[PDB]
């Protein structure tokens, strides 16, 4: 899969998961978030080669047109693929709000 | 809807559907396929600006964070959203063979 485990060792040109730490205060300036202080989002980046973790019918097609005809700007993107919840502790005034947001970490990649 | 309707008439950078109309022979060198000669498959492509037509909370905290630092290359990508089967016909020698390929054609696209 294009995940930690293949990605992270050592930087490749084609679409992987690339690390990302983010500090909600100092890379947002949300300081509304108590707890977690930050946490590791990811992203995915890198080019989509013909048949490299392709998505569907539409993604193999296009992967091979782009290798054909590069100048058209239609490659299928790197994208997520598999994502994880992160629960929040924020506070209104003096009420503490905890709420589970869905997808907000990366774990792996697809060209779509 | 990043859509036909709202993207085709005027070309803008932001992510929305781009039309593309693929000749199978002329544009991919296969000439294998009887029925039929062409589609449009069309793509995804542009700008994924904060919280526009945003899929997960992952790309909508991404939207931001690559506003603040363009650097990292962390954007969310505009990719296909809603997408349309398609019916080819095609001859193994003497045998004509219909096959119903799914998600072969972009109707809308998302920024994810």
Known sequence: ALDAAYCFRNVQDNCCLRPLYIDFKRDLGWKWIHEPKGYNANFCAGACPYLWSSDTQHS?????????????????????????????????????????????????????
């Open 60 to 112: 193999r097609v296009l992967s091979l047109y782009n290798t054909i005809n590069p100048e058209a700007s239609a490659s299928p993107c790197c994208v997520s693929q598999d994502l994880e919840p992160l629960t929040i502790l924020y506070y209104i005034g003096k009420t503490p709000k905890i709420e589970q947001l869905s997808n907000m970490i990366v774990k792996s990649c697809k060209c779509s």
